[PDB]
From a paper:
Aurora A kinase (AURKA) is a member of a family of Ser/Thr kinases whose orthologues control progression through mitotic cell division.
Interestingly, depending on the concentration of reducing agent in buffer, the AURKA kinase domain crystallised either in space group P6122 or in P41212. Analysis of the AURKA structure in hexagonal crystals showed that it remained relatively unchanged when the ATP binding pocket was occupied either with ATP or with JNJ-7706621. The hydrogen bond between Q168 on the αB-helix and the main chain carbonyl of K143 on the G-rich loop, observed consistently in the apo structures, was lost.
Author numbering: 127 to 390
Write the structure that this text describes.
């Protein structure tokens, strides 16, 4: 349905493992969007041609205001192009670098949007598994949008696919190569909540082997400015036992969330 000559390419929006994301405009409608470019050679070498099929299949059939839209795809002989909704206020990763940390109001609002979006995914037995600040984008009204469904799968799942990045947002069960379900995203929510308030994830380290030990043992401490209410929600989500992690409804109902989350 689409080809490269249908778009006017603009500036790079960001960079990923298999290529860049560019701002683009559809020549006929003048529709501004983003094009995620992936090199075929790289996907073959890494053996991630599946995963890319999953990202397209899963994300194309999701419709939620806090989930980034995947309008379609196309390809040539060398590259694969994903047609995405353009998020104009960038990443939560960049916002965090600018502010250093976020207040309870901004944190609680982001956690609400994330829990709402994850509740919709989990209803369709879709587990994201790669909820990282670089994958959380911002709409024109500054609302959070979950993006990058490359690691998404239908639950329950095991993993043969090896992890090549930081272990900071991954639960003990994923790190150990064990079985897992939707409770993986509940752990990631707790890691993000801590990082939004503190400015660094609770198991950050100089080495991968050290991070693994901290995650495996659930070895974290709160700075003095973290409030009782915030400590309570983070400590409820960062449970070694996946079955002990709360339901997303309990996250949305938490007193600290209700008290600081901005109302639409
Ligand atoms: N629609 C978009 N609007 C604005 N910026 C975007 C958009 N999509 C991606 N970006 C930017 O490009 C970066 C890379 O995008 P993305 O997470 O989709 O790629 P990836 O990490 O390489 O993919 P994968 O995990 O599937 O292998 C983002 O972190 C962000 O900075
Ligand atoms: Mg990414």
């Amino acid at each position: 349905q689409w080809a490269l000559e249908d778009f006017e390419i603009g500036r790079p929006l960001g960079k990923g493992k298999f290529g860049n994301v560019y701002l683009a405009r559809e020549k006929q409608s003048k529709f501004i969007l983003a094009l995620k470019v992936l090199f075929k050679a790289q996907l073959e070498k890494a053996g991630v041609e599946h995963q890319l099929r999953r990202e397209v299949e899963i994300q194309s059939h999701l419709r939620h205001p806090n989930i980034l839209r995947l309008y379609g795809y196309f390809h040539d002989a060398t590259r694969v192009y994903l047609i995405l909704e353009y998020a104009p206020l960038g990443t939560v990763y960049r916002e965090l670098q600018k502010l250093s940390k976020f207040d309870e109001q901004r944190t609680a609002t982001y956690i609400t949007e994330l829990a709402n979006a994850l509740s919709y995914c989990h209803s369709k037995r879709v587990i994201h598994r790669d909820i990282k600040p670089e994958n959380l984008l911002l709409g024109s009204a500054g609302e959070l949008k979950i993006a990058d469904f490359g690691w998404s799968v239908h639950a329950p799942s095991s993993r043969r696919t090896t992890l090549c990045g930081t272990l900071d947002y991954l639960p003990p069960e994923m790190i150990e190569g064990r079985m897992h379900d939707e409770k993986v995203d509940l752990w990631s929510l707790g890691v993000l909540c801590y990082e939004f308030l503190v400015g660094k994830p609770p198991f950050e380290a100089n080495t991968y082997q050290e991070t693994y030990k901290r995650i495996s043992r659930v070895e974290f401490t709160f700075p003095d400015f973290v409030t009782e209410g915030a400590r309570d929600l983070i400590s409820r989500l960062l449970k070694h036992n996946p079955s002990q992690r709360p339901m997303l409804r309990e996250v949305l109902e938490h007193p600290w969330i209700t008290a600081n989350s901005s109302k639409p």
